[PDB]
Design an enzyme around this catalytic site. Structure first.
Site, PDB file in Angstrom:
ATOM      1  CE1 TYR A 144       1.537   1.435  -4.748  1.00  0.00           C
ATOM      2  CE2 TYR A 144       2.074   3.788  -4.682  1.00  0.00           C
ATOM      3  CZ  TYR A 144       1.833   2.593  -4.004  1.00  0.00           C
ATOM      4  OH  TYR A 144       1.970   2.452  -2.615  1.00  0.00           O
ATOM      5  CE  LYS A 189      11.030  -9.835   2.069  1.00  0.00           C
ATOM      6  NZ  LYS A 189      11.784  -9.958   3.338  1.00  0.00           N
ATOM      7  CG  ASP A 221      11.146  -8.091   5.864  1.00  0.00           C
ATOM      8  OD1 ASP A 221      11.472  -7.817   4.709  1.00  0.00           O
ATOM      9  OD2 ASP A 221      11.628  -9.052   6.426  1.00  0.00           O
ATOM     10  CG  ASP A 245       2.599   5.012  -0.581  1.00  0.00           C
ATOM     11  OD1 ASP A 245       2.407   6.048   0.053  1.00  0.00           O
ATOM     12  OD2 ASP A 245       1.709   4.500  -1.287  1.00  0.00           O
ATOM     13  CG  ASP A 249       1.534   6.922   5.195  1.00  0.00           C
ATOM     14  OD1 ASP A 249       1.935   7.794   4.416  1.00  0.00           O
ATOM     15  OD2 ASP A 249       0.325   6.696   5.397  1.00  0.00           O
TER      16      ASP A 249
END
Lengths: 355, 355
Positions: A144, A189, A221, A245, A249
């Site tokens: 980000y 990952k 994942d 993030d 959620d």
């Protein structure tokens, strides 16, 4: 008599409503453990735009720098959605407060009360294995904020992390697991990402200082599957900014009770910004039904992480635990019979007095 | 009499077991619609390492180049996990087959049969709104393949996309929605990522050629909540490689029945690699209980997307729909009473003959 300075930035919509309860609770427990708050109210977000033309003013920023913590409500609403994107309340309040006080660690609890099993979208059998998770999300680094470019035919963003960034968020995760169930999952990952291989390197090395903690690794994942199929395995989950993030959620979703979710955003010096995880809820801003528990729990996190007032915090968490287990709930929790925003706050306060 | 050349790469563990059923089903429906297959078996993965020293040989790669599609089983197992990472069966089979045939589009269905409501980890009430989703994941681009670097103190990966990459995956998504429920959600993080803003630009422009399709946008974090709270809103979901990777896994999780999940990996010329989405399942490789439906459904996707044999495909999907609705299921679906791998295949084949 020790005094704690709080910058209270209630913001928009339900913000100022739920905040009123949190301050009622804070003023009481202050007085019960013989400390005092200086609760200093300033405008942030929509309210600040209407008053000063900016979501975050210099006078509010200075108040925050003069305080020990920021107790933060919610910002945003349809009135302000025709502003250019970078000036909208959410974007122009929080990102700069985080950068400015170096708030690199975001702590999001997901503890489903036994009372509220039914509200989760997961079948009860999965939830009854017991769900008590702390998501520790790196908050100021990663993709980000990396080097980016938007071209006519080609665009890119860069997921970049330094060792220092990884270490400081890893320690908060290890410190947290040390007083919880002694388990950290690092979510990455690492099968394809270089940044993820660094994460593993630096976190395996931080883990050597914490022999009480079992460190496990899981790809983002697989975590997304695991949060749905068997969330009871997680204790503390340590994530990059993007993966945290996404997964905070998902956690919010399996929890079921948005009005219960709290959030702490901390630096390495005891300073933090504490807020309900949910937004400004404009649909209901004009009513007296907003669930104030999130905000109240945020105030408890404030008490723990910034003021080291652990008993005060624990009282407040216990009182909410007890109120819910007695069926005393706001509309979002029980559609058929419910307390209003100020009755819920009063119920909680009532419960605290008995102890 | 038109002949279709298939490269059958059954792989390891349950691979060769479930494949046997898929070939039984393919040979029948071939003959029923008066076409023929040349089903050409080669070793891939563990089996190939044991025979040739490499997970993917030149002789297997050449067979694939001489075929119209690859029907692929599962690869991997504990025997081969002491190899260096880049030589392990999974890594050394699929990534090169994808690069080599330019398989940029990964299609993963998530359609929960009414029969199997119970197997989902979501409460039945959420699932009864009806869940029928096609995840279209860009498969060869993005952060997994961008410029990367692993340093001692700093590491990075680059999420890079070109317009061409975005357009070609977007079209497959639009083509799919056109014959489904006319809805595409683009999943991105356009509030912070440049690459995501390009996605929106290029996809909004592809959408102008598809006036029948309602295009909606949703951030990856909201999608992760939405897949749990209300998955019935999705029809076709279009995702980057990373976001699709994460979210296809979450979908697999809410679906509940891993042995039912299929996958197609396609280029822009009708060529594809078709496989069960689940792995090699070594725990059960020595038994006769593996669910062959995934592999069989993969063969149906092959029939549709590579051979334009839509009736054949539809027969096979109907026959599995009917078998399940009659309670005829493998162990992973019904622990108490179940068919073995070859009986399930036979049941399906039996059902197809009646039509």
């Amino acid at each position: 008599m020790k005094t704690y300075k709080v910058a209270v930035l209630a913001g928009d919509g339900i913000g100022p409503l739920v905040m009123k309860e949190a301050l009622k609770i804070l003023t009481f427990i202050a007085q019960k453990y013989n400390f005092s708050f200086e609760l200093n109210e300033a405008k942030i977000g929509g309210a600040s735009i209407d008053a000063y033309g900016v979501a975050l003013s210099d006078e509010t920023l200075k108040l925050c720098e003069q305080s020990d913590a920021i107790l933060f409500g919610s910002v945003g609403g349809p009135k302000w959605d025709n502003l250019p994107i970078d000036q909208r309340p959410e974007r122009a309040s929080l990102l700069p407060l985080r950068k400015h006080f170096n708030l690199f660690a975001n702590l999001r609890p997901c503890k489903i009360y036994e009372s509220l099993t039914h509200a989760s979208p997961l079948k009860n059998e999965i939830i009854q294995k017991g769900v008590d998770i702390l998501c520790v999300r790196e908050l100021t680094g990663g993709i980000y904020f990396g080097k980016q470019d938007l071209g006519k035919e080609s665009a890119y963003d860069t997921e970049i992390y330094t060792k220092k960034e990884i270490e400081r968020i890893a320690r908060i995760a290890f410190e947290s697991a040390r007083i919880r169930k002694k388990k950290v999952h690092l979510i990455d990952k690492a099968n394809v990402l270089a940044s993820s291989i660094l994460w593993r390197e630096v976190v395996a090395n931080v883990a050597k200082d914490y022999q009480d903690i079992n460190l496990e690794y899981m790809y983002v994942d697989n975590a997304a599957m695991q949060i749905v199929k068997n969330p009871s395995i997680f204790d503390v989950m340590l994530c990059s900014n993007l993966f945290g993030d996404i997964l905070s959620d998902e956690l919010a979703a399996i929890n079921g009770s948005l009005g219960l979710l709290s959030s702490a955003s901390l630096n390495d010096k005891g300073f933090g910004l504490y807020e309900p995880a949910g937004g400004s809820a404009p649909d209901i801003a004009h009513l007296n039904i907003a669930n104030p528990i999130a905000q109240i729990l945020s105030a408890a996190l404030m008490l723990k992480y910034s003021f080291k007032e652990e008993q005060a915090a624990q009282d407040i968490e216990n009182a909410i635990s007890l109120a819910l287990a007695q069926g005393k709930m706001t509309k979002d929790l029980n559609a058929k019979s419910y307390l209003n925003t100020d009755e819920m706050g009063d119920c909680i306060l009532e419960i605290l007095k008995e102890n």
